């Protein structure tokens, strides 16, 4: 067979430097273990400094912090500060009461 | 001797399903592999049972006749093997593989 | 910022059932393939000839092959050896 699963091969980006270890299975496993959604902050409005309570009339943004059924995600998952989690939950509950979410 | 080994290698089932009393619930019928010594036992017992249906008073004669028929293709024990392999193919998903 | 959770002083640092990677038996995977080969191409089909030959060799002497991969985890030996050093406990 001339085919390998993507999970068993690492694609080295262009312009990056590499070591011989980057072709091993250890690199594959190490990349899985340390795979965190750290790029969310730059794409996370609520981790930028905006007040989540100003989005109570924008269900599309709020729908990014609820599950498929509408359950607000725990702070352990959202990664927000205590204040933003508190404000975000209020925004979602207010949005639900207005009839938008 | 070569005829005997060829007959034993064709008649013995490669695998056999066994019931394992695992858990308080119903036992699981999981296909199990067989080694060559275990395969020969299964095939030999089938041969002896077929041999003992023949008319000769001498077991050697009945065994000889049975072995000659098996070496010539005709044997009623090939049905037994096909029925043991059918069951195993049905329970292929029950295998554990770890 | 990621919340670090610090444990209280503990009588032990131990994994109840250390996980081990148990490589699959080569004879059982061969049997699982042969059984599948018969399910598609049929029982005794000439397409599964190689599978039958390989299975016979794998199980010829031992029906599970030469199982020589038994392993035990050492996490509990290291965990108990290093706990006092790395727990960050204040001085006495």
């Amino acid at each position: 067979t001339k085919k390998i699963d993507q999970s068993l091969s690492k694609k080295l980006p262009k312009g990056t430097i590499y070591d011989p270890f980057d072709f091993s299975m250890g690199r594959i496993h190490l990349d899985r273990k340390y795979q965190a959604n750290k790029n969310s902050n730059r794409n996370d409005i609520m981790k930028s400094g905006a007040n989540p309570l100003e989005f109570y009339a924008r269900p599309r943004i709020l729908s990014r912090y609820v599950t498929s059924t509408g359950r607000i995600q725990h702070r352990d998952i959202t990664g927000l500060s205590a204040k933003n989690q508190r404000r975000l939950s209020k925004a979602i509950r207010r949005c639900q009461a207005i009839g938008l979410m | 001797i070569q005829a005997l080994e060829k007959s034993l290698d064709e008649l013995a089932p490669l695998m056999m399903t066994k019931t394992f009393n695992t858990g308080v619930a119903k036992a699981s019928v999981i296909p199990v592999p067989l080694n060559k010594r275990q395969r020969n036992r299964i095939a030999w017992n089938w041969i002896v049972q077929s041999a003992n249906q023949r008319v000769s008073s001498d077991f050697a004669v009945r065994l000889g006749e049975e072995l000659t028929a098996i070496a010539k293709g005709t044997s009623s024990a090939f049905e037994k093997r096909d029925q043991i392999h059918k069951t195993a193919i049905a329970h292929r998903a029950y295998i554990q593989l770890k | 910022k990621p919340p670090v959770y610090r444990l209280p002083p503990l009588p032990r640092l131990k994994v109840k059932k250390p996980i081990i990677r148990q490589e699959a038996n080569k004879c059982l995977v061969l049997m699982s393939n042969l059984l599948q080969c018969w399910s598609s191409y049929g029982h005794m089909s000439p397409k599964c000839a190689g599978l039958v030959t390989e299975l016979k060799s794998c199980t010829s002497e031992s029906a599970l092959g030469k199982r020589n991969n038994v392993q035990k985890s050492n996490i509990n030996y290291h965990a108990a050896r290093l706990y006092d050093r790395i727990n960050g406990k204040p001085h006495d």
Partner: peptide
């Protein structure tokens, strides 16, 4: 890199065969 790519070849093949058996289930 060859030394590493040789071990990687073996494991890939092994893990692309366990998947085939496990997936067959």
């Amino acid at each position: 890199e060859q030394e590493v790519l040789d071990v990687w070849e073996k494991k890939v093949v092994e893990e692309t065969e366990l998947m085939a058996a496990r997936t067959s289930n």
